[PDB]
Amino acid sequence: LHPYNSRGLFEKKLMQDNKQLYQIWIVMVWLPKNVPTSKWLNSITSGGLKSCDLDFPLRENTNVLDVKDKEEDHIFFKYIYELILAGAIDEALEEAKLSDNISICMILCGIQEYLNPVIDTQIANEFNTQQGIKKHSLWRRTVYSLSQQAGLDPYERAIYSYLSGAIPN
């Protein structure tokens, strides 16, 4: 427990050694589509595309790829906002993955703190491999820049508010 830890055992001890914060966490947490995936065909042909990624969307217009998955960044994110107060984020991961996103779904694996048999000793036994981010605080302040990003329309970011603690957007 004690002697030297990652960030994973800190968070456990926090919740251990108070019980009004632990209840506060439990309150907020307590209260289907078929998508074939793929992109990047139709984009190069009309104009430019030039590099494949949903970071092309962020260098300029968000009309540059297929626009029936521009649909999905509104709509399946709306499903995700019902989900996060029904609890979890790995639930929301499984729906992000049907949203035709597959590198913007890495942000929901980002929310994990470092759980490791190299730096935890009671989380070294329900895992035998590295999990999460050990730069989880630079992750938190960088997913918080998106909560204010003004290129990001509100139907993406409102969960990026919430991933770093929720401004009411």
Binding site: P32, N34, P36, T37, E94, K97
Partner: protein, 204 residues
């Protein structure tokens, strides 16, 4: 859930299911034999149990498969499961769900209006009418599902310990198709209507 579930490939479905579909019949062979009790068993009792296998479900939005879902639960109950019920239903995969499982007691005929000759009729009884106790017998044939609980008082109100309030259902699972699974319980149920005093609260 459904990702890439298409009216192109419905060919992948005879792959994705049919892997664990072998595992099914390797088990439920052991009970089906009826006349020559117990067979080869891998260990597989411990395996394939609980919330698990079921996750294949949602093809109820698109077909890769659409009848291979129905199998699991009907198969995955075994003879030692006349004492306890592992949790092969209670929670299931994203979105949609098996619910054509009591339309194996009847026809599957409720969507179409014609009977499509649904296979499972057999293997459904292989483990319904040959495996006792709250589980598949509080869900089908009287009850409402939340197993190993049924007290009509008639027996202790303590959390099962004296067992005559639940036998009343399992007595209608004692049929001749059962071999030895039935053949001690047939002596347990004699009590319920036994004239000495027993039929004074036991005729529920």
């Amino acid at each position: 859930n459904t990702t890439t579930k298409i009216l192109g490939d419905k060919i992948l479905g005879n792959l994705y299911s049919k892997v664990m579909n072998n595992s099914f019949k390797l088990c439920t062979l052991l009970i089906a034999i009826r006349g020559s009790n117990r067979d080869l068993k891998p260990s597989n009792l411990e395996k394939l149990l609980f919330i698990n296998s079921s996750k294949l479900v949602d093809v109820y939005t698109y077909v890769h498969f659409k009848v291979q879902i129905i199998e699991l639960l009907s198969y995955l109950v075994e003879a030692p499961w006349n004492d306890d019920y592992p949790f092969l239903l209670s929670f299931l995969g994203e979105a949609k769900s098996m619910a054509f499982l009591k339309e194996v007691l009847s026809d599957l005929s409720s969507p179409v209006q014609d009977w499509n000759l649904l296979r499972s009729l057999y293997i459904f009884f292989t483990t319904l009418l040959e495996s006792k106790q709250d589980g598949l017998s509080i869900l089908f044939l009287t009850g409402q599902f939340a197993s190993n609980k049924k007290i009509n008082d008639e027996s202790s109100i303590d959390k099962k310990s004296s067992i005559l309030t639940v036998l009343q259902k399992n007595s209608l699972l004692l049929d001749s198709t059962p071999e030895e699974v039935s053949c001690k319980l047939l002596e347990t149920i004699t009590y319920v209507l036994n004239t000495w005093t027993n039929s004074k609260i036991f005729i529920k």
